Amino acid sequence: AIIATAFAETVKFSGSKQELQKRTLALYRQFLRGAPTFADLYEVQFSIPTIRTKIRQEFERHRFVDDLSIQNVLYAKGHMEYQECINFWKQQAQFLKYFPEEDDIQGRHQPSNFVDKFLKNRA
Amino acid sequence: VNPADRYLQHVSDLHQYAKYIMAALPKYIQGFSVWKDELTLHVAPSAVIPVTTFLRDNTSTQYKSIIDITAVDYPSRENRFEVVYNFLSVRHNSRIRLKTYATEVTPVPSIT
Amino acid sequence: SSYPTNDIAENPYWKRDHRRAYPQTAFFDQKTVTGLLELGSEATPRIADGEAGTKALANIA
Amino acid sequence: AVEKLLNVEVPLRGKYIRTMFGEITRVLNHLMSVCSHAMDVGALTPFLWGFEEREKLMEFYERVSGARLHAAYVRPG
Amino acid sequence: KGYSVPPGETYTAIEAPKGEMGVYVVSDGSERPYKCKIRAPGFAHLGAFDHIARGHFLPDAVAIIGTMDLVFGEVDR
Amino acid sequence: KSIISYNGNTIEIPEEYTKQAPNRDSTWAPAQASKTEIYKNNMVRFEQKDLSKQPMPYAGIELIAQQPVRFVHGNTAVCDGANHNGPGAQGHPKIFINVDAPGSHACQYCGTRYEKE
Amino acid sequence: EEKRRVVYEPLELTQAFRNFSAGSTAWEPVGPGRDDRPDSFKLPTPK
Amino acid sequence: VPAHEIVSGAPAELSRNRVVRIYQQAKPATQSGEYGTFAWRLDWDIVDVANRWENDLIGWQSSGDYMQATQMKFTSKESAIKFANKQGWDFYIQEPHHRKFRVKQYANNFVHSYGKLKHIRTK
Amino acid sequence: GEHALRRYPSGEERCIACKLCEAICPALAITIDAEERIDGSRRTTKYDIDMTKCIYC
Amino acid sequence: MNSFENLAQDVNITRSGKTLIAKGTGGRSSRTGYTATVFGANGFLGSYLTAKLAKHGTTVVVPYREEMAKRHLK
Amino acid sequence: AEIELTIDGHKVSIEAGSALIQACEKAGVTVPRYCYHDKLAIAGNCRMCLVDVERAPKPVASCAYPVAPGMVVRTDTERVKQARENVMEMMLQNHPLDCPVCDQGGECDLQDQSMRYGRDRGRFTEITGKRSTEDKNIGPLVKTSMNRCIHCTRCVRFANDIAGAPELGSSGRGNDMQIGTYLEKNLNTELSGNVIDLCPVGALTNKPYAFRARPWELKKTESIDVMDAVGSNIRIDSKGVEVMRVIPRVHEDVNEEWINDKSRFACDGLKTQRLTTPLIRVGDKFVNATWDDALSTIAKAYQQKAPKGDEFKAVAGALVEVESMVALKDMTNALGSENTTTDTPNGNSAPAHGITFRSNYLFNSSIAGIEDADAILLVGTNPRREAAVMNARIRKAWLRQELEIASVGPTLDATFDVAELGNTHADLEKALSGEFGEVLKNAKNPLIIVGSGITDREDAGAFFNTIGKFVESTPSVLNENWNGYNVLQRSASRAGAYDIGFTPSDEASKTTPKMVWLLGADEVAASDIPADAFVVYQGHNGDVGAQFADVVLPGAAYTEKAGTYVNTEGRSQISRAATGPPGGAREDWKILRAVSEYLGVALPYEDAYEVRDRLAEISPSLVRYDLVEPTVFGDVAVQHSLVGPNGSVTPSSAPLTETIENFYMTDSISRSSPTMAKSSIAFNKDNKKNQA
Amino acid sequence: REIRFHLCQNGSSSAPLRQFVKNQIGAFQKANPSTKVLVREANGVKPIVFARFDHGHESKIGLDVSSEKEVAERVKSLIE
Amino acid sequence: MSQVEPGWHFWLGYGVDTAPCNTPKEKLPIRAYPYKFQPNYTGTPGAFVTYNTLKPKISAWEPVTKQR
Ligand SMILES: NC(=O)C1=CN([C@@H]2O[C@H](COP(=O)(O)OP(=O)(O)OC[C@H]3O[C@@H](n4cnc5c(N)ncnc54)[C@H](OP(=O)(O)O)[C@@H]3O)[C@@H](O)[C@H]2O)C=CC1
Ligand code: SF4
Ligand code: SF4
Ligand code: SF4
Ligand code: FES
Ligand SMILES: [Zn+2]
């Protein structure tokens, strides 16, 4: 395996936090440019800004992470997920893993209080 | 007869060879273990690349072919995973093992 | 069956088990090799004055 | 691998018998491999002649073990 | 329960007709293996595909599959 | 005949299929689940189906009671369970039964009762 | 059937996994065993 | 303490809803061996609704809880605690119980009773 | 091929519920519940094989 | 984990008197307790209906007219 | 005071005069054995622990060879390995081929030591063959199959020494020795299901769990035992929805490896008559119902009756969790009525001793402390029945030492030797003044046990007056370093109920309730609850108490829930849940937490950790699990429990009655089991049980 | 209504409360006969008083103060 | 293929030399019941249906009320 795959990056670990911040910045740009490609590629039902707000929300999940080393593994996993999504190796059934709640309302009787959780003993 | 009795002379030869290998790179070899015609060098992760090159390049070693490399987790250790490398010198008809360590997030450098 | 193993009375099993006679991993630190280079060996011991030889071993230990 | 860990010595007949069934396994492997390659390129007849010889060997596996294609015959002891 | 294996580690390699196949097993001392690992011979062969199959034509990317003998019980497991 | 299927609806099966076997009417275990409970629990899938081609294989608790009781002159009665036309080791491991108490003592593998006389 | 695709769901089995490792030996099954170390590479006893 | 629950790929519900237990296995009252009483087991407390339930069909023990079969062994107590709060889990720890040392003599069995015997040994 | 529970001469079920077929089965196809029956003999109440996860070893 | 969305509760009693304890969490391998007969289940509406109905484990009884359509419900 | 020797090169120091096998156990050296046990006498029967000892011609038995200084022991001699193979082959030549039908398959001591130490093959192949031993019907609880006996005397040594039932023995010479009652006499004792964990082979085995399951299948779970005073440790083996057996894990303080009969064989009634759904009474008939139906019927009947205060009685029962009592007490006190009583007769009032000062109602010496005792007396109790493990403690300490006993109450048949004093409070006070003021004042470590059966007597406070005056006047029974007033509590809930404050006030005992809550609470009579009252029974299985209810609500029993339990000593201990509640039963505090929402009460917790925080708010010795603390308030508490019933209660001449009528059927699980049902008839006075 | 409190048994800043217990339980029983007290002891807990009033309303106070009269002033303030 | 008798099925597949007409009565297994021979009934309404051989694991309470 002399030559590598198209959107590959040799995995490299940064000792400063600001270089990691620059790389996650560039990576958000790379996801965000490729969202029309994903909407065309996986033949989804909805609009491009829902993919874009999914991308924003998945970075909103990991904002207050302190440890640089954990930020590094998190960056490498995110770039691998990008490389799978952009090359069309993932399929539409695993692309729509990312959207479990949009596709259908699961049903009536959502338990919120203690009583509705109790009547079905958490189901 | 004990099937471990046929190994014993070669196991002594393997001992003397490994003591030499430790005396050649004292900066990089933490230990070794000889089980029964099975040699294992015990090396730090920042010491992976300098030992492997030696195992490729020294004429006495010449461990050209990579055979199989993998990991084993011991969750009781602080450095959870250990990473094992198996080599085969097809010149000298010899095998060798190289064991290092790595936690879940900290790396070990690649010999690719 | 073969003869020294199907034998009704001459063998005991502990003479002819080899699962329990397995040998151990000879794990050698860096410091026990300093012991083998400075103390010596059991084939050729370079140690005199054994009561002081234990103390000579102990600082390497 | 388990014999090496267990420190036991298999008998003499058990060695010659796994030499032999390790070689009709080799004959069967090269038979399947060469004939499947010759089909992937385009020769059709060695596929069937070789699989005939494979049937003649699967009869021997059916005698030795129970099942033809998957035989738990060679054990760690 | 099973028999118990003395605590240890081994890599035992033999020659399958596909090539060198070995197994690396770590024995706890219990009666279950702490860890097993097969080295599939065809794993390294399919991993060496794009080193060889550069610059060849598309029909010659298929007769090269037949020589590295990919049965795929090996490569993934 | 008519058993209630959890709703007041009577379901009707023939009387030859409520037996545990055509040897024995009743159950031979405290959790044997008698046939009327079985047809009561899932009759949704005995629909449109022949009951006769179901197995119903001859309960063995009754085929062992009709075997005669062996009589042994000695103290201990020894047992194989083997045939002696068969070339090999068939039957159960050999166990030795004390016949001293009143009555006939059964083999715990085969159930053949042995009695001292 | 609804979405006309495969869906990935949390796990649920029709028969639970029963491991039988609970119920191993309570006697230490092998000994310490001997050693293959040659007499040259173990530390000398003093005197 | 580093927090590795976001980089193991385990779901959030396992780390926030499930309590786990570290314990040393008790010496069995049936047999007199003690070999399984050294390693510290890690095991998850069961879920009320999700544990097991009898199948309508045959009587198979069907489960919805998936960690019921997993169980870990550790060398020391500290290693189990370090791993358990490193993976982000709520644990309870159960202290082991050894037998009290009491001195036994065979010659205790027949000592001279000056008053009432108050016992008959039999051997 | 397929499975069969034999019987003794003069008709007795042969399965003494020793659970050894369950303990060895490499794909966990066997499931057994066992109870002491009316005779005091040890027999299986429920014996069962899933033939979709049997591997014919 | 999965959840019984269609049910208000765990234990439901019918109007006829039958008592139905739903087992387990939601999902494929669990059972709700109800027995339902959908007539015309090969139809356009009925396929979605018995999709949603057998999703949580209610026992569906399908009276079919032809043998070749009904395969897509299994 | 100690002796240093060498085993296997290892150097070990052990207390003088011990056995050699204790030195091998201390040094980590594994020595195989069949007739040695920690809680039993030493015998040299099985000949398995032979060992190479320098300055000895023959291999000596390591269980009975005493420790001497300068000792060099080797266990890996070729002679010792030969000796173990020899003795093992000798054991196996009359032991029958029963391993597929034996109940100890993966559990057999003979079997796991035959791989590790015994011979590969067998030379036993005579035509005459093995001997055969007649089966011996002992009792309904113990299945007995004595072909596979190895004569280790361990059952005989135990039923002689600790159980106090001398009916077992060994009658014969040679191979014709048997281990059983000679006459075919039925064996009673209060712990007869403990000989079947003790036999190393499966000759004495479990009768209801005869052939049901199998130890590699079982999932083990470490829980706490209710339906016992002491709250012994158990081990629950589960197939996964069913519960197979409980079996004692060791704790030297609470049970010392030995567990009750009634605790053990009540797994039968755990699964036989359970409640799996709520039931609403229509009138002469129950119907089962929806949850919303039952809980809204409770809310509608509250709005119909409207008990404004002191009319919502909430009585708990024999086995409950502490957390369900937190839930119930919080619900009634946020309701506005502390009519909050316990189940026993004379449970409607304060129980004649303080909820104040925990040392009033607890076993104040440690349970480990009864071993140190000199001369102890009990009032109003039978410790053979209630806390049958405490009887093993009393007989064991009485056997090893010079101990003196008398009893005040019914004429009890102890295992050990009591003296009689009388059947009257006057006989009590006369015996305290006459002989045993001198004995208990003379003795170093005496103690006094008080049954909770006389707490339930209406003349209770006279007894507590006399004993509090005696304990306060005598400085030997109560000093700094140990405490000597002690009580026993029958149920596992009563100590936790008195920790939490679950007791009525003096005002609450006067009114008649309009709405009664039974949480457990099985021993209520028909007359105890009013006829107009709307009663609701929350509990895990059907009983007397479920038959009186207008609504029943299924709960999780002690196996199905994780729970805090407080014993007579005062230990807080958690039960781990083995299985889940079947059908539709829920956990007990969650049901009360949900019934509160349909009333006007929002309980401040809603999760399992917030219950633990509320429980630490009640008292922080209930989040401090399995620790025992001393009491600095031992002097003040006896005075404060003396002042109350001084002159308030006159001692009537009613004789002191037995607390429990039978041993075997006393709570909701034990009365449902058919094992106790056919046990209590077979352990009634018959010719098979008369000693004659 | 009922009042309850908690001390550590070890002499770690819980001695003044403890002396207040040993001197004043008998006076507080007469001061409030309908009120039931409960005293508990665990070696780690800081000294604290919970008083519970009508309809399940309770209030707490911490008792890191080294005079019995001050402890009585705290308890008297929290009955109010 | 399922319509051929068991002892004959092993002979058509060349397992045994001697047909089950010519085997002796020693190799005839002794039985205490009659023989039936159901071939196979897949698709036929006489197909096999599976069920619980044993009753449910945990029993429920049959309700009785009480006049207090
Ligand atoms: N625009 C629409 O779709 C509208 C439809 N509806 C009604 O909804 C229901 C189903 O709608 P839809 O799904 O679209 O159409 P369907 O295809 O479902 O209608 C036919 C269904 O009923 C079965 N069917 C027809 N005749 C018979 C008969 N004699 N015996 C047994 N089964 C028969 C059919 O069997 P098989 O599967 O073999 O064909 C099929 O299942 C119908 O009642 C329809 O009147 C309501 C208003 C508008
Ligand atoms: S349970 Fe299985 S292994 Fe045991 S006798 Fe029956 S069929 Fe054989
Ligand atoms: S107790 Fe004896 S007969 Fe039973 S399983 Fe163990 S060795 Fe076999
Ligand atoms: S009856 Fe059991 S415990 Fe007693 S001597 Fe015999 S085998 Fe041992
Ligand atoms: S245990 Fe020491 S000889 Fe029996
Ligand atoms: Zn037999």
Resolution, in Å, please? 3.2
Which chain H positions have a beta carbon within 8 Å of K33's beta carbon? Answer: 32
CA atoms of K495 and K484, how far apart (whole Å):
18
Are the C-beta atoms of J2 and G12 separated by less than 8 Å? Answer: yes
Structure tokens at K472: 């306060």
Nearest CA in chain K to F98: K132
Which residue type sits at C60?
I
Nearest CA to ligand 2 atom 5: I15
Full domain range(s) for residue H76: 1-123
Pairwise CB contact (< 8 Å): J18 & F7: yes
For residue K139, give the 3-state DSSP assignment.
Answer: coil
The ligand that comes nearest to the alpha carbon of residue K47 is 5
Pairwise CB contact (< 8 Å): A114 & K594: yes
Q: Show me where the domains of chain A are located.
A: 1-123
Structure tokens at K418: 């009591």
Structure tokens at K140: 């309904």
K494: nearest Cα among K486, K503, K483, K481: K503
Q: Is the CB of J31 under 6 A from ligand 1?
A: no
| Whether residue K288 sits in one domain with residue K164 | no
Q: How far is the CA of K203 from the centre of ligand 3 (A)?
A: 9
Q: What is the 3-state secondary structure (H, E, C) of K68-91?
A: CCCCEEECCCHHHHHHHHHHHHHH
Q: What is the CB neighbour count within 10 angstroms for residue A5?
A: 10
Which chain D positions have a beta carbon within 8 Å of I55's beta carbon? Answer: 70
Residue ranges in K180-321 assigned as alpha helix (H): 261-264, 291-305
Which atom in ligand 1 lies closest to the alpha carbon of residue J64?
38
Q: Is the CB of K102 under 6 A from ligand 3?
A: yes
Q: Is the CB of J48 under 6 A from ligand 1?
A: no
Reported as half-sphere exposure (CB side, CA atoms, 13 A), residue A96 has a value of 21
Chain B adjacent subunits, 3+ CB pairs under 8 A = A, C, D, E, G, H
- Measured in Å, how far apart are chain C's first and last C-alpha atoms? 51
For residue F27, give the 3-state DSSP assignment.
Answer: coil
H-helix or E-strand spanning residue K517: strand K515-519
CA atoms of K401 and K445, how far apart (whole Å):
13
Which atom in ligand 3 lies closest to the alpha carbon of residue K108?
6
Chain K adjacent subunits, 3+ CB pairs under 8 A = A, C, F, G, H, I, J, L, M
Nearest CA to ligand 3 atom 1: K201
Q: Which residues fall within 8 angstroms of residue F49, CB to CB, at 6 or more apart?
A: M45, M46, M47, M49
Are the C-beta atoms of A5 and A87 separated by less than 8 Å? Answer: yes
Full domain range(s) for residue F100: 1-117
Structure tokens at C43: 């084939």
B41: nearest Cα among G28, K486, C27: C27
K101 closest CB neighbour out of I18, I22, I35? I18
CA atoms of J4 and K683, how far apart (whole Å):
50
Are the C-beta atoms of M65 and K287 separated by less than 8 Å? Answer: no
Which chain F positions have a beta carbon within 8 Å of J35's beta carbon? Answer: 44
K430-433 own/partner pairs: CB under 8 Å, 24+ apart:
K431/K406, K432/K466, K432/K470
Nearest CA to ligand 2 atom 6: I15
Number of domains present in the structure of chain H = 1
Are the C-beta atoms of I32 and I16 separated by less than 8 Å? Answer: no
Q: Which residues fall within 8 angstroms of residue L73, CB to CB, at 6 or more apart?
A: none
Structure tokens at J40: 């015309």
Cα separations (Å) of J51 from A76, A123, J28, J41?
40, 20, 11, 10
Does I54 belong to an annotated binding site? yes
The ligand that comes nearest to the alpha carbon of residue K92 is 3
Rg (CA), chain C: 21
Are the C-beta atoms of K24 and K8 separated by less than 8 Å? Answer: no
Rg (CA), chain B: 15
Pairwise CB contact (< 8 Å): J21 & K276: yes
Cβ-in-10-Å burial (0-12, 13-18, 19+) of K267 comes to buried
Which chain G positions have a beta carbon within 8 Å of C57's beta carbon? Answer: 43, 46
Task: For K366-379, give the DSSP string.
Answer: -TGGGGG-SEEEEE
Structure tokens at B65: 């072919």
Size of interface G-K (CB pairs under 8 A): 27
Which chain E positions have a beta carbon within 8 Å of B72's beta carbon? Answer: 26, 34-35
Report the residue among J62, J65, J70 best suited for mutation to probe ligand 1: largest number of ligand atoms under 8 A from its CB: J65
Q: Which residue has the tokens 């029943």?
A: K552
Task: Please tell me if residue I52 touches chain M, with a CB cutoff of 8 Å.
Answer: no
Q: Is the CB of J45 under 6 A from ligand 1?
A: yes
Full domain range(s) for residue K540: 272-344+491-629
Which residue type sits at K199?
C
Q: What is the CB neighbour count within 10 angstroms for residue K581?
A: 26
The ligand that comes nearest to the alpha carbon of residue I33 is 2
Instruction: Look at strands E8-16 and L48-52 and give their pairing.
Output: unpaired
Residue ranges in K541-625 assigned as alpha helix (H): 544-547, 588-598, 608-618
Full domain range(s) for residue L40: 1-80
**What are residue K517's DSSP bridge partners?**
K314, K536
Cα K100-K102-K104 angle, rounded to 5 deg: 110
Structure tokens at K395: 């007989």
CA atoms of K323 and K493, how far apart (whole Å):
11
Please state whether at least 3 CB pairs lie below 8 Å between chains G and E. yes
Nearest CA in chain B to C19: B2
Are the C-beta atoms of K164 and K107 separated by less than 8 Å? Answer: no
**What are residue H91's DSSP bridge partners?**
H20
Nearest CA to ligand 1 atom 29: J65
**What are residue K483's DSSP bridge partners?**
K478
Q: What's the DSSP call for residue B82?
A: E
**What are residue E27's DSSP bridge partners?**
E8
Structure tokens at C33: 């090799």
Task: Please tell me if residue B2 touches chain D, with a CB cutoff of 8 Å.
Answer: yes
Distance from CA of C5 to the nearest CA of G (A): 21
| Whether residue K125 sits in one domain with residue K1 | yes
E69 closest CB neighbour out of D4, D33, D41? D33
Structure tokens at K424: 């009257």
**Diameter over CA atoms, chain E:** 56
Task: Please tell me if residue H57 touches chain M, with a CB cutoff of 8 Å.
Answer: yes
Which residue type sits at G42?
K
Number of domains present in the structure of chain L = 1
Please state whether at least 3 CB pairs lie below 8 Å between chains M and D. no
Q: How far is the CA of G27 from the centre of ligand 1 (A)?
A: 70
Q: What is the 3-state secondary structure (H, E, C) of chain G?
A: CCCCCCCCCCCCCCCCCCCCCCCCCCCCCCCCCCCCCCHHHCCCCCC
Which residues 100-119 of chain A have a CB within 8 Å of chain K? Answer: 113-115, 118-119
Which residue type sits at D30?
H
Dihedral (CA of K389, K392, K396, K397) sign: positive
Cα A38-A43-A49 angle, rounded to 5 deg: 50
Report the length, in residues, of chain A. 123
For residue L18, give the 3-state DSSP assignment.
Answer: helix
Q: Which residue has the tokens 């099942």?
A: D67
Beta-strand ranges (E) seen in K43-182 are: 50-53, 60-61, 72-74, 142-144, 170-171, 178-179
H-helix or E-strand spanning residue B24: helix B8-24
Q: Which residues fall within 8 angstroms of residue L36, CB to CB, at 6 or more apart?
A: K355, K356, K501, K503, K505, L2, L3
CA atoms of B87 and B98, how far apart (whole Å):
8
Mutate which of L14, L18, L38, L45 to disrupt the K interface (most K C-beta within 10 Å)?
Answer: L38
Dihedral (CA of K355, K361, K366, K369) sign: positive
**Diameter over CA atoms, chain C:** 57
Chain A adjacent subunits, 3+ CB pairs under 8 A = B, E, G, H, J, K
Distance from CA of D41 to the nearest CA of I (A): 34
Distance from CA of C2 to the nearest CA of G (A): 25
Cα separations (Å) of K511 from K308, K343, K518, L64?
12, 17, 17, 42
| Whether residue K317 sits in one domain with residue K185 | no
Structure tokens at F108: 């715990």
Please state whether at least 3 CB pairs lie below 8 Å between chains D and J. no
For residue J21, give the 3-state DSSP assignment.
Answer: strand
Please state whether at least 3 CB pairs lie below 8 Å between chains D and E. yes
For residue K236, give the 3-state DSSP assignment.
Answer: strand
Q: Is the CB of J70 under 6 A from ligand 1?
A: no
Q: How far is the CA of K60 from the centre of ligand 5 (A)?
A: 10
CA atoms of B18 and B94, how far apart (whole Å):
13
Q: How far is the CA of K37 from the centre of ligand 5 (A)?
A: 9
Are the C-beta atoms of L48 and L17 separated by less than 8 Å? Answer: no
Reported as half-sphere exposure (CB side, CA atoms, 13 A), residue K183 has a value of 10
